[PDB]
Each structure stands twice: as structure tokens, then as C-alpha cells.
Amino acid sequence: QYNNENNFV
């Protein structure tokens, strides 16, 4: 299982 998040502000 691969779990990620990417937020760019």
C-alpha cells in the first residue's frame, strides 16, 4: 500500500 499527499501553495 502506497499513501501520499502533495499540496503546493
Side-chain angles (χ1 to χ4, degrees):
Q1 189 190 65
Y2 183 101
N3 304 294
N4 219 328
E5 65 165 37
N6 312 275
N7 294 298
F8 307 84
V9 189

